[PDB]
Amino acid sequence: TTALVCDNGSGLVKAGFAGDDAPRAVFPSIVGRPRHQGVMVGMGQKDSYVGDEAQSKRGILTLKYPIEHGIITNWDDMEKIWHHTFYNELRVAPEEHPTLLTEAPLNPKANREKMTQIMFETFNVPAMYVAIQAVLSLYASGRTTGIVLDSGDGVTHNVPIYEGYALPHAIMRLDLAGRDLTDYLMKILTERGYSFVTTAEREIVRDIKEKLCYVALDFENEMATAASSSSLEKSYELPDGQVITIGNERFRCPETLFQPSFIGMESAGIHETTYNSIMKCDIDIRKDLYANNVMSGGTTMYPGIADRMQKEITALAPSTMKIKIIAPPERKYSVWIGGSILASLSTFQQMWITKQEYDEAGPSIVH
Amino acid sequence: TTALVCDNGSGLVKAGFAGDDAPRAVFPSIVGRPRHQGVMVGMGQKDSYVGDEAQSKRGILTLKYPIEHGIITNWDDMEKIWHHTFYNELRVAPEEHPTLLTEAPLNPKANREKMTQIMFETFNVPAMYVAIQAVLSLYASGRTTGIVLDSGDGVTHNVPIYEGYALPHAIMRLDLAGRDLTDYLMKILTERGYSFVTTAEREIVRDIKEKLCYVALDFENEMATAASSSSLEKSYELPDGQVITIGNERFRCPETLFQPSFIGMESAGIHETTYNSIMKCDIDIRKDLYANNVMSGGTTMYPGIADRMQKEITALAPSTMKIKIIAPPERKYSVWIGGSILASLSTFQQMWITKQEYDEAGPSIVH
Amino acid sequence: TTALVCDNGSGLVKAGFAGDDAPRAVFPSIVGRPRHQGVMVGMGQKDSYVGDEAQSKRGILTLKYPIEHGIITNWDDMEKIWHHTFYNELRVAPEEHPTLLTEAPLNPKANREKMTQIMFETFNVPAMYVAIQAVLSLYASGRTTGIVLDSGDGVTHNVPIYEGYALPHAIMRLDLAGRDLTDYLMKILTERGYSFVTTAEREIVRDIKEKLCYVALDFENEMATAASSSSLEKSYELPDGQVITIGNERFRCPETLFQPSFIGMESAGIHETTYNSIMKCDIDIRKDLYANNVMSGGTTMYPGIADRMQKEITALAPSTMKIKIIAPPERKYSVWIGGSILASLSTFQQMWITKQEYDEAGPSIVH
């Protein structure tokens, strides 16, 4: 009966049936093989633990994310993510639900084909559709115009949409955030003697990326007050007992979003990719792209944005033009709240790929 | 029919069929040749007396323990231990029982090979398995995680196990206790004029190590109250008639377990080997190694432990972490209660070495 | 007058004035307190012996290396290393020489500050500079491009440099070798019954790490010929009289450099850190990083490298690309031969920290 909205997270895969409030299942997408000798012999141990149990059994496994730089690294682990989610989380049969899957707008072909093809032949869903994650965040936002920011660990994208069409030549992909923000945080916590070399401990770094980080209002003046003796230093507690005190680096790591030079990436910041995508759109349409800048995803939830993002864009943009930055409550579930609206509406249900069409055309003509 | 659990004591060899309550036979493992001229001529005297009769015929023999510093000194005496136990104690035929043998985790190779090989070719058992003594104490404990302490006269070991695998690089071997505690007790009883120079009399020292010793709560303050006129002095009775009054040295000898400098050993105490083995294990796993410290063996049965061990570890360990020291009732039979659980369970019975495999591979591939 | 190049060894501190051939003084960096009771009463004994005399007075002391995991453990012993070297080895006055000190590229802050600050305030040098050990090995190598390997007991590093700039986001630190290779050698010599438990005896293990070890060409086939009766076994002689015969473990211990799983470290081998640091550098620059792989330090002097290192990298690297592994004669003095070239050249002498600047800025602005 009911359609299923399953979002192919970069993080953080999100799953829930059509409507209403939020995804029913969210989990960190990890598969982990056992890296220690089995001498206990109980045995009772699984061949590979998936999440969430692989986030409660850290250090006895070696966590490997299955999606890396926005591409699925191997479909052997990906299929196990899917199977684990459908059977032992959601508890639904594939033959009972038409599904809805997500992708990234600037991702290589035939990665959507191979995906679509494997999911139809392995799980035998009765119908399917694959949406780019940015378009769904417009439905979630409830605006009919604007530039969409889907930023997750680790693929960001910048898609401009105007009432009610998209401009093909204006889409910008930054590989700037967020797994590289995790790795950069791990490199600048070494500056205060906190060395987290192992795979498992890298998750702890990610947890400090959630809770303790913030973004500055003005870099130079936050760097100034960091030099002062005042308490920028916040004390985190670690599962083994250690108390970790981080200062400067706490606001330094997210600031990378405005200066990619810090992480050593040549590309221009969110600051400039916003401006340069708007100034690749037609003159008349720019008037309503200003004041319809819509952020989304989990990596836009740091405290110091959006009024940093606002002040930076407003400084580079032409004088005497109104700029408002639209940032929804609960951006982490934005894409999913999109998907729910889509699959419930008539009539584009009948633009979904159905099994009869798949039998005829296979991976051809997916576009 | 029934499998036999036979524990290769360092002491104190322990033997009993599979299940249930306790080993059927325990004995001090001594062989003794006759050190006096035979002029009685009855004769009727055995070429060498084994225990228990060699502990009732002391002084007419020279007792020689067959396992010394955790290694079997010669298999000529060891084979006589085995033969004596199977035939004139247990009263079982070797061809009727699959056996279960024990070893130490950090013991030289090919001492397990040579053992396995001699026992298969001499006693012709139909199947065999050799377990390290620490792993069996986990089965006895009924916990799935924790650091294991097998301390017997005279090899201790410290093995960390986490659900349900072992960490290879964290095993610590101290040669600190217990035959050196016997020898140290013999050296500090000389301080009160009790000189026990002969081999036989050394057993009497060992008996005073059992009954009269205790461990302090705080060394410095027990040393203080020893200087006081109050009765720390306890009167032991000796088989010849002598009444021996020991004071300070009564709590001094076990304290060596926390300060190896007293016996002149360079290595760090149980205090520090516990901490340093935990801080060689992964950060996430340390959280559940704290509060799963499991003691075992006969030399952990002194009265003043475990709350000395507790207070000392709790002082060196990081602040705000829960530490409980798990010390079973009847630790002297712990290993054996382990072995019983192992050989009764399916399926690792079919990971035992069988005669057909021994015919094919011999001492090769025992690992 | 003349500047002094003093290399802050992890081993093995190296010292010599500016130019020409080799360091004038090399020594094992040990401080040792006396672990036995002083009953001889001559007396004439020093409070603590430093090396070299602490390597001729082993067993009466407890040797403690002052640098542990690449960090200075306490500056009380470090200052005594420095004082001993300058006064009773080199025989130079601190006020007479501008000095040159070394560090590690991925080492916590403020460990270079605290060092610089203590050495300026304690020894009152008229000028100072602190170089990372890898950059100096490029000057020694005489190449203008390439990835630098500084591997000493016990911090390795992997720094890529291209004509004539460095790439910040490509530096990799492995804590894989070499004190852990010493400890691993001590753990696998126990497999042949050679138990070297004490601190002093650990030096003897280190000496067998120098002389008798080798690296395999192909692991699986060297493991095969080890199973054969052919003489891989080499006989070492020990200062007490013992003749030690080691076989398999002789080539097993260095092989850890290609498989960190053996020592239980989660990180990827030199094999993969070489490849993964090159494939984090820009596409155009990789062409000349291939064939400019430059090794350095004392722990790269084992016999079986570099043609193992070559064959392993050449197998993982893309097809049809020339790979040469540059390994200098006398790699143990490489860093120092670097330092000599640096301090002799104009003009970056005037980028050294001078006393006037230290008076003004102190430990601030060392970077």
Short mmCIF file of N, CA and C in Angstrom, two decimals, chain A residues 221-304:
data_model
loop_
_atom_site.label_atom_id
_atom_site.label_comp_id
_atom_site.label_asym_id
_atom_site.label_seq_id
_atom_site.Cartn_x
_atom_site.Cartn_y
_atom_site.Cartn_z
N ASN A 221 37.89 39.71 14.29
CA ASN A 221 37.58 40.13 15.64
C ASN A 221 37.36 38.95 16.56
N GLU A 222 36.90 37.79 16.06
CA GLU A 222 36.85 36.60 16.90
C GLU A 222 38.24 36.05 17.18
N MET A 223 39.18 36.19 16.22
CA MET A 223 40.58 35.84 16.37
C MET A 223 41.26 36.71 17.40
N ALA A 224 40.90 38.01 17.43
CA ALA A 224 41.30 38.96 18.45
C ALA A 224 40.86 38.53 19.84
N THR A 225 39.56 38.23 20.04
CA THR A 225 39.08 37.87 21.37
C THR A 225 39.54 36.49 21.81
N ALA A 226 39.93 35.62 20.86
CA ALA A 226 40.62 34.38 21.16
C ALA A 226 41.99 34.57 21.78
N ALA A 227 42.72 35.62 21.37
CA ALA A 227 43.99 35.99 21.93
C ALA A 227 43.87 36.50 23.36
N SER A 228 42.69 37.03 23.72
CA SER A 228 42.35 37.45 25.07
C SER A 228 42.15 36.28 26.01
N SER A 229 42.21 36.53 27.32
CA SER A 229 42.20 35.50 28.34
C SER A 229 40.81 35.02 28.67
N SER A 230 39.79 35.72 28.16
CA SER A 230 38.38 35.39 28.28
C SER A 230 38.01 34.00 27.80
N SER A 231 37.01 33.38 28.40
CA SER A 231 36.70 31.99 28.22
C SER A 231 35.98 31.65 26.94
N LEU A 232 36.69 31.52 25.85
CA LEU A 232 36.21 30.88 24.65
C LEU A 232 36.31 29.39 24.81
N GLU A 233 37.24 28.91 25.63
CA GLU A 233 37.48 27.54 25.98
C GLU A 233 36.30 26.83 26.61
N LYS A 234 35.82 25.76 25.97
CA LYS A 234 34.75 24.92 26.47
C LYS A 234 35.26 23.51 26.72
N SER A 235 34.86 22.91 27.85
CA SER A 235 35.34 21.61 28.29
C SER A 235 34.40 20.49 27.88
N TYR A 236 34.84 19.59 26.99
CA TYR A 236 34.08 18.43 26.57
C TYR A 236 34.50 17.23 27.40
N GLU A 237 33.61 16.25 27.60
CA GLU A 237 33.94 15.02 28.29
C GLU A 237 33.93 13.85 27.33
N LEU A 238 34.90 12.94 27.46
CA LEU A 238 35.17 11.89 26.51
C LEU A 238 34.75 10.57 27.12
N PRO A 239 34.38 9.51 26.42
CA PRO A 239 33.84 8.31 27.05
C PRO A 239 34.79 7.60 27.98
N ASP A 240 36.10 7.68 27.75
CA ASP A 240 37.09 7.16 28.63
C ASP A 240 37.33 8.06 29.81
N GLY A 241 37.23 8.97 30.09
CA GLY A 241 37.35 9.86 31.22
C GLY A 241 37.99 11.14 30.91
N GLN A 242 38.56 11.43 29.89
CA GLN A 242 39.35 12.57 29.59
C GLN A 242 38.51 13.81 29.41
N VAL A 243 39.00 14.95 29.88
CA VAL A 243 38.32 16.21 29.73
C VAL A 243 39.13 17.03 28.76
N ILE A 244 38.51 17.41 27.63
CA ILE A 244 39.19 18.05 26.53
C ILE A 244 38.77 19.50 26.49
N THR A 245 39.74 20.43 26.46
CA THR A 245 39.50 21.86 26.47
C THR A 245 39.91 22.49 25.17
N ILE A 246 38.95 22.81 24.29
CA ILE A 246 39.21 23.45 23.00
C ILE A 246 38.74 24.89 22.99
N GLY A 247 39.54 25.78 22.39
CA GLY A 247 39.30 27.21 22.28
C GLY A 247 39.15 27.71 20.87
N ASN A 248 40.17 28.37 20.33
CA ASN A 248 40.22 28.98 19.00
C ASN A 248 39.66 28.09 17.90
N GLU A 249 40.19 26.87 17.81
CA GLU A 249 39.82 25.88 16.84
C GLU A 249 38.34 25.53 16.78
N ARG A 250 37.60 25.74 17.90
CA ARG A 250 36.16 25.63 17.99
C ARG A 250 35.37 26.49 17.02
N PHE A 251 35.80 27.75 16.79
CA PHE A 251 35.19 28.58 15.77
C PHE A 251 35.98 28.58 14.48
N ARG A 252 37.24 28.11 14.52
CA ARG A 252 38.07 28.06 13.33
C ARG A 252 37.57 27.05 12.33
N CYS A 253 37.28 25.80 12.77
CA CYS A 253 36.82 24.78 11.83
C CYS A 253 35.61 25.15 10.96
N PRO A 254 34.45 25.64 11.41
CA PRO A 254 33.36 25.97 10.50
C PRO A 254 33.65 27.13 9.58
N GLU A 255 34.50 28.09 9.99
CA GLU A 255 34.87 29.24 9.18
C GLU A 255 35.42 28.87 7.80
N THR A 256 36.00 27.65 7.64
CA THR A 256 36.38 27.01 6.39
C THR A 256 35.32 27.14 5.29
N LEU A 257 34.02 27.19 5.65
CA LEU A 257 32.91 27.39 4.74
C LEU A 257 32.95 28.72 3.99
N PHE A 258 33.53 29.74 4.63
CA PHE A 258 33.86 31.01 4.03
C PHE A 258 35.30 31.10 3.59
N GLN A 259 36.20 30.46 3.80
CA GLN A 259 37.56 30.46 3.29
C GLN A 259 38.07 29.06 3.06
N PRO A 260 37.92 28.48 1.88
CA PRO A 260 38.41 27.14 1.59
C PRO A 260 39.92 27.02 1.55
N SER A 261 40.66 28.13 1.52
CA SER A 261 42.10 28.15 1.61
C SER A 261 42.65 27.51 2.87
N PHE A 262 41.93 27.59 3.99
CA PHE A 262 42.31 26.97 5.24
C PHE A 262 42.45 25.47 5.15
N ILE A 263 41.55 24.80 4.42
CA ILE A 263 41.61 23.38 4.22
C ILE A 263 42.41 23.04 2.99
N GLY A 264 42.88 24.04 2.27
CA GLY A 264 43.67 23.85 1.08
C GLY A 264 42.90 23.54 -0.15
N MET A 265 41.68 23.90 -0.26
CA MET A 265 40.91 23.71 -1.46
C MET A 265 40.87 24.99 -2.27
N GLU A 266 41.07 24.87 -3.59
CA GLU A 266 41.27 25.99 -4.47
C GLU A 266 40.01 26.77 -4.76
N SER A 267 38.88 26.11 -4.77
CA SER A 267 37.57 26.65 -5.00
C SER A 267 37.14 27.80 -4.14
N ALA A 268 36.20 28.61 -4.60
CA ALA A 268 35.75 29.79 -3.92
C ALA A 268 34.68 29.45 -2.89
N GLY A 269 34.56 30.23 -1.79
CA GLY A 269 33.68 29.92 -0.67
C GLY A 269 32.21 30.01 -0.96
N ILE A 270 31.35 29.54 -0.02
CA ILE A 270 29.90 29.64 -0.14
C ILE A 270 29.43 31.06 -0.40
N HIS A 271 30.04 32.04 0.30
CA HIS A 271 30.10 33.45 -0.05
C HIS A 271 30.09 33.74 -1.54
N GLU A 272 31.12 33.26 -2.25
CA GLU A 272 31.27 33.57 -3.64
C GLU A 272 30.49 32.65 -4.55
N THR A 273 30.24 31.37 -4.20
CA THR A 273 29.47 30.49 -5.08
C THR A 273 28.02 30.87 -5.13
N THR A 274 27.51 31.45 -4.04
CA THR A 274 26.19 32.05 -4.01
C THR A 274 26.12 33.20 -4.99
N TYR A 275 27.03 34.19 -4.86
CA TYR A 275 27.07 35.32 -5.76
C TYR A 275 27.29 34.94 -7.23
N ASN A 276 28.29 34.10 -7.53
CA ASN A 276 28.60 33.69 -8.88
C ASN A 276 27.55 32.81 -9.54
N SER A 277 26.70 32.09 -8.78
CA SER A 277 25.58 31.36 -9.37
C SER A 277 24.43 32.28 -9.67
N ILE A 278 24.19 33.29 -8.82
CA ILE A 278 23.18 34.31 -9.07
C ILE A 278 23.59 35.14 -10.28
N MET A 279 24.84 35.61 -10.37
CA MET A 279 25.33 36.33 -11.52
C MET A 279 25.68 35.45 -12.73
N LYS A 280 25.16 34.22 -12.79
CA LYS A 280 25.11 33.43 -14.01
C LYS A 280 23.67 33.24 -14.42
N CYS A 281 22.71 33.75 -13.66
CA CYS A 281 21.30 33.75 -14.01
C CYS A 281 20.90 35.07 -14.64
N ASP A 282 19.89 35.05 -15.53
CA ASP A 282 19.34 36.20 -16.22
C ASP A 282 18.95 37.40 -15.36
N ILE A 283 19.19 38.62 -15.89
CA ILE A 283 19.09 39.88 -15.18
C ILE A 283 17.77 40.06 -14.48
N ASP A 284 16.64 39.81 -15.16
CA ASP A 284 15.34 39.99 -14.60
C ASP A 284 15.09 39.05 -13.41
N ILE A 285 15.60 37.83 -13.48
CA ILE A 285 15.35 36.81 -12.46
C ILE A 285 16.16 37.02 -11.20
N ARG A 286 17.34 37.68 -11.27
CA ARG A 286 18.11 37.94 -10.07
C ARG A 286 17.42 38.69 -8.93
N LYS A 287 16.46 39.60 -9.28
CA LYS A 287 15.65 40.40 -8.36
C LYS A 287 14.88 39.60 -7.29
N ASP A 288 14.42 38.39 -7.66
CA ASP A 288 13.72 37.48 -6.81
C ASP A 288 14.63 36.28 -6.43
N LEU A 289 15.86 36.12 -6.95
CA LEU A 289 16.83 35.20 -6.33
C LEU A 289 17.41 35.83 -5.06
N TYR A 290 17.68 37.16 -5.05
CA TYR A 290 17.92 37.90 -3.82
C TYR A 290 16.71 37.85 -2.92
N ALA A 291 16.70 37.41 -1.89
CA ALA A 291 15.67 37.25 -0.89
C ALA A 291 14.95 35.95 -0.98
N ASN A 292 15.49 34.99 -1.75
CA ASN A 292 15.04 33.63 -1.76
C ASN A 292 16.28 32.76 -1.82
N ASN A 293 17.18 32.94 -0.88
CA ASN A 293 18.32 32.07 -0.66
C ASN A 293 17.92 31.07 0.41
N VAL A 294 17.69 29.79 0.06
CA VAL A 294 17.22 28.78 1.00
C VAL A 294 18.23 27.71 1.38
N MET A 295 18.63 27.68 2.67
CA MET A 295 19.61 26.73 3.15
C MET A 295 18.92 25.42 3.53
N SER A 296 19.67 24.31 3.61
CA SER A 296 19.09 23.03 3.98
C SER A 296 20.20 22.12 4.49
N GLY A 297 19.89 20.87 4.84
CA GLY A 297 20.83 19.88 5.36
C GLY A 297 21.33 20.09 6.77
N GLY A 298 21.96 19.09 7.35
CA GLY A 298 22.51 19.07 8.69
C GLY A 298 23.73 19.92 8.91
N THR A 299 24.56 20.15 7.87
CA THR A 299 25.78 20.92 8.08
C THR A 299 25.55 22.41 7.97
N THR A 300 24.30 22.85 7.76
CA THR A 300 23.95 24.26 7.89
C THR A 300 23.36 24.58 9.25
N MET A 301 23.44 23.66 10.23
CA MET A 301 22.88 23.88 11.56
C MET A 301 23.85 24.42 12.61
N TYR A 302 25.11 24.75 12.28
CA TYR A 302 26.03 25.41 13.20
C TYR A 302 25.49 26.73 13.77
N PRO A 303 25.69 27.12 15.02
CA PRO A 303 25.21 28.40 15.52
C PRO A 303 25.84 29.58 14.93
N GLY A 304 26.19 30.30 14.43
CA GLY A 304 26.78 31.47 13.88
C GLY A 304 26.37 31.75 12.47
#
